[PDB]
Amino acid sequence: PPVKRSLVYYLKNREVRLQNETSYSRVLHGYAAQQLPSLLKEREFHLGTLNKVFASQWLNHRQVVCGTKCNTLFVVDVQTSQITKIPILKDREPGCGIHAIELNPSRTLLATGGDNPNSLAIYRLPTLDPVCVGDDGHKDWIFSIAWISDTMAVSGSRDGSMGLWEVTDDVLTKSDARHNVSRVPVYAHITHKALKDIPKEDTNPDNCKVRALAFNNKNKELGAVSLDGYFHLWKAENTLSKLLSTKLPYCRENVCLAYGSEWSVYAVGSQAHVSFLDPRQPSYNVKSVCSRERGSGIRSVSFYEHIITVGTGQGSLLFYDIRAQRFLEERENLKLTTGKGWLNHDETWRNYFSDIDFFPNAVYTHCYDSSGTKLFVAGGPLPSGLHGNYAGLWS
């Protein structure tokens, strides 16, 4: 007996409740993942004078949190186009911007860079109340975060260290007991459960920066990508423990990492190519697809069923199909391109970039909502000397 995969059976069975199965779940979403990219249209938002958006996640069907190079943390109501700023959490001590935002699997805790970029800030969801202090575990900025459980998060940094943090019930109850007594919010205290550095390779021993993290829930692995071109895999069942290290086929701008749970494949961005790695495979068994957007860099990547969505410095999003092993074509690779957003004609632009009226808004972050039909895209100009933001909702 062959597998019944036809969507006509799903529709006609649904009309009868004739066991329209959960078997079709991968058919329905896989079909949508191929259809959506050509149906999307841009609705830009005006964020004012914020510097760049570096991280973003959906908090609700209606709201997206965004972190910025200005260190501002803010929320967009994408239905009303309304911007709400959030207080930035300070450290245990009275001593860049927000390069990473992450949600724990149960969506009760949000993890961001703090007022100190070296320090992890935790907020309570959905309210955005503070939970705990900015720490002093890292000596430099937090580049990436990954919630390996509802209580445990790993955080990378420019010094190459990986802090493992656990928000225990005590941390929550101390935050809540303190906020009920003191009208001014007072944090709970935190420290890393363990602090481990990535193995130092023959490459520059200071350039051990861990730029991206991704969690494989199936095997309880944490994958990690450094900017020296090396990929690392760690077991994350209970505590951060090394499994293997593999050198990536490309060692340039390895800034984003995503994991396809339906493929057991890690997608790794680079200055030009997306690489598809499987740590259980031989090191030569790696697929590499060239974006051809050469010189602009891949800046964000994610899996939607069997489709990879790739944001780039050419302010453009490509879509790639694993099963077909090629880009989606337009109804000639299909690509969206961001609008102009807003640029600040500041002194640096005046001196070095004044000869250019328009720059592409690099997609530093993108994410699909829970329905799988809306794609939030945000970023800013590629050059570090340029100040100005871009955001919009594609639907």
Binding site: K52, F54, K69, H99, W141, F143, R158, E253, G295, G297, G313, A362, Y364, L382, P383, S384, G385
Partner: peptide, 5 residues
Amino acid sequence: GESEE
């Protein structure tokens, strides 16, 4: 082309 971090 002064990429961010």
